[PDB]
Amino acid sequence: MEFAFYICGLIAILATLRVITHTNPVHALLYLIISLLAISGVFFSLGAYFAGALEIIVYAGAIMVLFVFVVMMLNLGGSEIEQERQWLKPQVWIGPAILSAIMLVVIVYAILGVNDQGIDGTPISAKAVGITLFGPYVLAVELASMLLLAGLVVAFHVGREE
Amino acid sequence: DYTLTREIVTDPLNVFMGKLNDMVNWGRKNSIWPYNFGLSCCYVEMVTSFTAVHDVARFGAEVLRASPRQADLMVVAGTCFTKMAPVIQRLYDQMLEPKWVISMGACANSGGMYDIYSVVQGVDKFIPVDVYIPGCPPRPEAYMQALMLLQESIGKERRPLSWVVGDQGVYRANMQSERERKRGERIAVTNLRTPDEI
Amino acid sequence: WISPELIEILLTILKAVVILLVVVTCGAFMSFGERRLLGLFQNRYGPNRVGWGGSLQLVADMIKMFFKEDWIPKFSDRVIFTLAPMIAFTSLLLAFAIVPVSPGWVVADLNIGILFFLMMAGLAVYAVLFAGWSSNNKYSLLGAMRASAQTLSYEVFLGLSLMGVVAQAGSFNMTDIVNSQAHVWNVIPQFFGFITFAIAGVAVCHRHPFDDGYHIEYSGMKFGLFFVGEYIGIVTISALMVTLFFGGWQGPLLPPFIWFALKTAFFMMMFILIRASLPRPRYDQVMSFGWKICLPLTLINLLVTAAVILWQAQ
Amino acid sequence: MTLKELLVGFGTQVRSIWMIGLHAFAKRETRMYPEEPVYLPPRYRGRIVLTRDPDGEERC
Amino acid sequence: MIPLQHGLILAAILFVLGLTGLVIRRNLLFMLIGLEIMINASALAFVVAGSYWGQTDGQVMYILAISLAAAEASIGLALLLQLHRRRQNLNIDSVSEMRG
Amino acid sequence: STEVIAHHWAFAIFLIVAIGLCCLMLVGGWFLGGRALRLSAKFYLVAMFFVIFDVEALYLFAWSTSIRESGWVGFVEAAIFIFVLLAGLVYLVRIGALDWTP
Ligand SMILES: CCCCCCCCCCCCCCCCCC(=O)OC[C@H](COP(=O)(O)OCCN)OC(=O)CCCCCCCCCCCCCCCCC
Ligand SMILES: CCCCCCCCCCCCCCCCCC(=O)OC[C@H](COP(=O)(O)OCCN)OC(=O)CCCCCCCCCCCCCCCCC
Ligand SMILES: CCCCCCCCCCCCCCCCCC(=O)OC[C@H](COP(=O)(O)OCCN)OC(=O)CCCCCCCCCCCCCCCCC
Ligand SMILES: CCCCCCCCCCCCCCCCCC(=O)OC[C@H](COP(=O)(O)OCCN)OC(=O)CCCCCCCCCCCCCCCCC
Ligand SMILES: CCCCCCCCCCCCCCCCCC(=O)OC[C@H](COP(=O)(O)OCCN)OC(=O)CCCCCCCCCCCCCCCCC
Ligand SMILES: CCCCCCCCCCC1=C(C)C(=O)C(OC)=C(OC)C1=O
Ligand SMILES: CCCCCCCCCCCCCCCCCCCC
Ligand SMILES: CCCCCCCCCCCCCCCCCCCC
């Protein structure tokens, strides 16, 4: 259980690091899908079975499909992206990487000073999640429907062709 | 007696290598996927052979790919018009090894009755042919007979099993001609049915 | 090394391996059986010469596709081009990995179940997308976008068609789903769920009549991987339909695996008959049917199923 | 589309499936070349020969 | 027997990686990709926190997070397609006409 | 329990042998045998509709497995959710968003 957690976390970290430094958009999206599968494995190792199932079903099965679809529609041949490699220049990324490293050290220092009895990994099913969802979290469900409706209306208004 | 391509040579055929070659030839001759290519009326007779009354599927030769990459057999079933000849050559070049060619009908054999300004006189002017079918059109069972002739020719050819080990030359069997094979039983014919009946 | 725990572990692993091998063999023999059954439906014989009754034909195409020259397009993305048939095979194979073929004969008794099936189908759309993109052919790319838009239009209600059966069982587990069918099979209460699941399962498997092509560049063994994965998906969809709507392995007299195999073979034959019988609708008609008819039908079926369940819980 | 159109179309699809299944229950129309020899009518235009007169000399 | 700090550290690492990808990339598509990495890392942090406390609240917050991620991906890709239609490039530095 | 760890081992072997079988099939196919347009926005719109309705589908997935525990109150809430879903679908169909042909 822990062994799967560490391997899946390492795979997610390495795949995301491959994502943010890659030039090909389809390869970057493939590495992102791999990282999402690894994060789903992390979810399954922690007992969040519904979260891992939705991580593959929706995040790696709908949202990344939309990203891949849009990349095909653009026909991205790396025009002025691969031919420049501006993010690979050390003078470009040395600043933001140092900033992200400083923020990571601050967050990790805050994390390490918290009480931790360990995660038991007892499986929390989708039945309990649905009980909470339509019990104490009813208005979250209905206003999330309104949020998805707003996203639908906005994306239809903007993404037409005429 | 064999013909080499990389020369009139002899049989190169360990006993396990011969068995592997026989297994590969059996699998290749029993799974022949033709390319769906329509040139003229001979194609109508070919797809007639594909239908229920003849059922060329019984020989495992019905899959009829629309892509040259997935096809193992090219049937030139029709006239090789001069505007269609580069198309035929390009589709043949897009095919992958091993590939075989059947000329179907007098047009594909030699130009047929169309010794005319706009017709290439036979497809073997520019692409190599394995089996020729005379006829205008050959009937569907003539196409099936040519398919069996191609199966016999495939069943004792020699090709490399792998591209990393061994001889990479292709050895094709120098068959006895069907004319000389059938001459004994054809000349002995004396009487035929009179053409006034059904 | 003699211990009952290790013996049970090895027995369960051996049962899973047997299930995997039988499913892959049944997919290849399903390609051969599609040729034979199309012959039966069309007043002919099909392949009946290579071996006894044509039974050795599949070995002949396997040998032919193995010893065909392996070819990749020159300006193609090699990794993605190789990766598409991997997905097309493995996705619905791993979807089969939850199917209970008999009491005590299952690979994984997961608590997610048909959620794992939905995971596998949502991953399986990438095979079509990757085959279209990586081939470096604009006809193949356009065909892949059309096919993937169709599969999204039917994947949008595949799970909602299963949700009536899930609601009746009260669980995502497949053993609980087939145990809730101990008295009446789910095809009777979830009939509209059954037909919507049938339409969605045929559409996401790229079967007739939902079949400028994204496979024209593939050849040799990758094309065979595409075909064998398609037939494995046919077997997986048929087995899932049997387990979710026709009691799984439950039956009066025959052994449970005999009942499961008979029902799966019947739905396999119905796949073949659907290909032989129906004409192909237009693309816009197919997608309008997916969005306007089937998805509201699944939603209304779920609502009525919940109303019946809560009314019957006194 | 109309509900009646959908129902009529569904019944039409069921009818097509039923007729193809009954076609499966029918007699095969295949002539099994080459095991079954092809019947040819006596004036069929196939291979050309040269014949002999009844005295045995060639007619040409 | 997995520490809560280890899961939070993994989520923080993924979050800062996504933010770095959002900053260093001139392409709008890679910016949207980094945004998706960031929101998925935050949702993973919520899942880790919910699994430590043995509550469904982490998975419920995950559900809300991915609903937001889906709708934001939809809107962002619509705006990216509009940008590609009206400018034929995805350079985000060129979209800078309002300043001062 | 021995049964669950046996099933975990069997599932792991299933995934490993399936992936390895497909990999070995590709390797054998490579080793054997000798050698020798602008996409419309409707594609994006359809994929976007799939994403949005798939998220609403996940909400209904969570509801469906716990229908008896939620009671009639959960039925009323899910009926409101499904009515909002269907109103959005009716709106999409009526404005020509879901019409492939113009
Ligand atoms: C081996 C070295 C590395 C080799 C290269 C990488 C290969 C893939 C490695 C990651 C996936 C497999 C990890 C190993 C899992 C083995 C099984 C295991 O550990 O099960 C434990 C646990 C079972 O559940 P639980 O009830 O908690 O068990 C306690 C016992 N009662 O299990 C769980 O709770 C969850 C089990 C894991 C989650 C499911 C599978 C996730 C798959 C993620 C793939 C990500 C993409 C990989 C791409 C690789 C190529 C770049
Ligand atoms: C124009 C605007 C739109 C209008 C609407 C259009 C869409 C309409 C969609 C309708 C959907 C109807 C779905 C009905 C399902 C009802 C059955 C059901 O869900 O029963 C559940 C119950 C099992 O549940 P339970 O008893 O709880 O078992 C676990 C034990 N604790 O099951 C049982 O106990 C067995 C009950 C068997 C019931 C069989 C009869 C009903 C289902 C079959 C209908 C067939 C219709 C045929 C075609 C009609 C014309 C279209
Ligand atoms: C293991 C699981 C699978 C096992 C196999 C068994 C299930 C197979 C399911 C096959 C589903 C095929 C669905 C095809 C839907 C086609 C819809 C469509 O686009 O129809 C278009 C057509 C005309 O549309 P319209 O807009 O009116 O245009 C008129 C313009 N002049 O509109 C019409 O003609 C209206 C009617 C359309 C079709 C209605 C649905 C028919 C479904 C197929 C028949 C299934 C019968 C049962 C089979 C056995 C099931 C066990
Ligand atoms: C998502 C899908 C939504 C739609 C389906 C929903 C579920 C089914 C709900 C009920 C459907 C009833 C359909 C209408 C039946 C009666 C009318 C009818 O058959 O219409 C079709 C057609 C009409 O005839 P017409 O085309 O005008 O030709 C001139 C002939 N006078 O007449 C004909 O073609 C001739 C008669 C054909 C009868 C076909 C069978 C009708 C009953 C089917 C019951 C269920 C079958 C399940 C699968 C069986 C096969 C495995
Ligand atoms: C080409 C290859 C690409 C990569 C393929 C996958 C990489 C990893 C391969 C090795 C996997 C090793 C074994 C992993 C663990 C298996 C057992 C397991 O998942 O156990 C955890 C849990 C058990 O549930 P259960 O025990 O019933 O719960 C009650 C409490 N005990 O069960 C669960 O939580 C079940 C849910 C997790 C199942 C994950 C299955 C694989 C998912 C990724 C599929 C990728 C498909 C190919 C690529 C698609 C395109 C990217
Ligand atoms: C090797 C596995 C084959 C599975 C089935 C392949 C597709 C159906 C048979 C081939 C075929 C195709 C494609 C076809 O399009 C066709 O119509 C012209 C035929 O009839 C002559 C066919 O026989
Ligand atoms: C064309 C416009 C390009 C804009 C690029 C902006 C890059 C900003 C990089 C910031 C780097 C900060 C480095 C760390 C500073 C010290 C730590 C934070 C403050 C305490
Ligand atoms: C098309 C069906 C595919 C099934 C794949 C899995 C096959 C597993 C076979 C298991 C056989 C034994 C089942 C338990 C014993 C009960 C039945 C005994 C008579 C067969």
Ligand code: SF4
């Ligand atoms: S040989 Fe005769 S039948 Fe064949 S293509 Fe030529 S004209 Fe047509």
